[PDB]
Amino acid sequence: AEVTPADVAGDTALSTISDSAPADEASAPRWRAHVNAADERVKEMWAYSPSMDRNVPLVVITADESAGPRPVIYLLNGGDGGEGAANWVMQTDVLDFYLEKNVNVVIPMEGKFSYYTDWVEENASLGGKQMWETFLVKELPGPLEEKLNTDGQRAIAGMSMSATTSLLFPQHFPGFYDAAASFSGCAATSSLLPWEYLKLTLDRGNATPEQMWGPRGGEYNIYNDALINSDKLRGTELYVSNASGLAGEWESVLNQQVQSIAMAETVVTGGIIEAATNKCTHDLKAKLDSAGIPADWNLRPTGTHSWGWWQDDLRGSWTTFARAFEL
Ligand SMILES: OC[C@H]1O[C@H](O[C@H]2O[C@H](CO)[C@@H](O)[C@H](O)[C@H]2O)[C@H](O)[C@@H](O)[C@@H]1O
Ligand SMILES: *[C@@H](O)[C@H](CCCCC)[C@H](O)CCCCC
Ligand SMILES: [Cl-]
Ligand SMILES: [Cl-]
Ligand SMILES: [Cl-]
Ligand SMILES: [Cl-]
């Protein structure tokens, strides 16, 4: 990319990267065993965020030295944030897949129910002050890309809640990202229905969308509406997809009365989630097509599980990334 970390960081106090977890860590994260069993190129790093006063864990797939400096992909988890079991590391072969591609991949393992944005208000249930856009865009790239010896190219990818984030970041900082991948989300956030979809994610973290982006339709909410500001994506290589499934983000790939009742619910909820995302994606495509902004589209049918589609999204988005990075 032509825009450097220092170009977007400006005044911002930068992150400090450590190769070891804080000594005050009480218990080992669930994902640590997965890192420890993967190739030596998969590393656990920790980035201190000055704005949040938080140590953020990162699962990093490092490139080999056979071709020198390589690009970096910032891959975001959904609502889980990497703080539970419903994430890239624990539900997909993300580590093995990218190891073979020879590319740097950085997966933050904190940020549950945050939309990876800068929140207007604090929320103790989510760690207090949330400044994930400042962290991911301004605090982290400079020191981390230096440590990884990247070639100066970068991409942002997100799924579900962070499939809004991966469209907002390149719009907020045009030219910073070479590519952006949005894996099954809703670009719109200020319209009636899209605002209510923010509540599905935020209710799980004891939060409201007003704490995050202020009043619906307000200045900051519109700034964070990726459908309204879709034209600002021009210049970025894009990959937009669908992870339509019955068993969603919560599900990994007793009596027959309760086994059939619970199964009836996933078909219904997965169906409402699929329908909601399908329209959001259709509106974005119509808006980008009308503006002459090209994207790689992976609109898929209803699958058995959403995580099966999300693992397939790592493959699908590789065509966008290989093209944007000239690999
Ligand atoms: O779709 C908009 C509404 O989404 C949430 O509520 C729905 O989902 C809950 C959990 O499955 C149900 O209990 C509830 O009946 C649904 O309406 C959100 O909590 C609402 O505020 C939104 O209007
Ligand atoms: C992620 O696809 C999804 C929210 C997408 C926005 C369109 C509805 C999430 O799984 C659904 C809510 C489950 C609780 C986190
Ligand atoms: Cl250290
Ligand atoms: Cl901490
Ligand atoms: Cl494969
Ligand atoms: Cl609070």
Numbering used by the authors: 30 to 282, 290 to 363
Which lines from the publication concern this structure?
Recently, some mycomembrane proteins including PorA have been unambiguously shown to be covalently modified with mycolic acids in the model organism Corynebacterium glutamicum by a mechanism that relies on the mycoloyltransferase MytC. The mycolate transfer from TMM to various acceptors are known to be catalyzed by mycoloyltransferases (Myts), a family of enzymes specifically present in all members of Corynebacteriales. Porin mycoloylation is abolished in a mutant strain deleted for the gene encoding MytC, one of the six mycoloyltransferases described in C. glutamicum proving that this protein is either directly or indirectly involved in this modification.
Here, to further explore the mechanism and the specificity of protein mycoloylation, we took profit of our TMM analog library to obtain crystals from MytC trapped in its acyl-enzyme state. We tested both the TMM-C13:0 (analog 2), a water-soluble analog of TMM and TMP (analog 6), the previously characterized inhibitor of the reaction. The Polder map shows that S189 Oγ atom forms an ester bond with the carbonyl of the analog. Electron density in the MytC-acyl enzyme was well defined for residues 30 to 363, except for the segment between 283 to 287. The meromycolic chain of the mycolate C13:0 is directed towards the exit of the active site cave, while the α-chain is more deeply buried and establishes hydrophobic interactions with residues of MytC α11 helix. The β-hydroxyl group, a determinant for PorA modification by MytC, does not establish polar interactions with MytC. The MytC catalytic triad residues S189, H341, and E310 are clearly in an inactive configuration: the H341 Nδ is at a distance of 14.8 Å from the S189 Oγ and 13.5 Å from the E310 Oε1. In the apoform, a small helix (η3) contained between residues 270 to 280, is positioned between S189, H341 and E310, blocking the active site pocket.
